[PDB]
Amino acid sequence: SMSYDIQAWKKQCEELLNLIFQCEDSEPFRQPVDLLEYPDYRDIIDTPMDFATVRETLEAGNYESPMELCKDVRLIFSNSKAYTPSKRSRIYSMSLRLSAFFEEHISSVLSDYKSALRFHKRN
Numbered sequence: 825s826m827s828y829d830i831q832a833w834k835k836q837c838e839e840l841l842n843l844i845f846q847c848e849d850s851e852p853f854r855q856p857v858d859l860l861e862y863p864d865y866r867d868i869i870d871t872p873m874d875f876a877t878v879r880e881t882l883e884a885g886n887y888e889s890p891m892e893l894c895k896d897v898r899l900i901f902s903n904s905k906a907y908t909p910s911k912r913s914r915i916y917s918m919s920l921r922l923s924a925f926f927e928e929h930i931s932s933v934l935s936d937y938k939s940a941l942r943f944h945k946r947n
């Protein structure tokens with residue numbers, strides 16, 4: 825029921841995305857890059873991603889695991905590092921801080937989920 829609950833990650837991720845939306849550091853990443861306004865973005869970035877898209881994919885039940893959610897969120901950060909590569913850019917620093925925040929908080933979500941999988945597969 826609650827120990828090793830394989831669905832608990834969904835609400836944990838919803839809560840984490842809420843905190844992320846509150847962070848001033850997420851401001852550049854809350855919505856898709858305006859591709860019609862900044863067309864050179866697609867010359868550099870193959871797969872755009874943003875937190876509004878992640879939040880909707882989760883809400884729609886279209887992540888099979890928190891690892892799938894984590895893959896999309898990491899893509900937000902790898903896309904920022906590719907488009908904005910300079911350590912001097914304040915946007916780089918923003919992305920860096922928010923990535924560290926995300927990775928800190930997602931850690932337990934993943935480890936708990938994977939432990940639950942080990943438990944149910946074992947038994």
Ligand SMILES: O=C(CO)NCc1c(Cl)cccc1Cl
Pocket residue numbers: 852853857862865904907908915
């Ligand atoms: O990568 C991002 C996410 O919003 N921002 C960099 C950016 C700037 Cl500062 C200005 C115009 C376009 C873009 Cl993509």
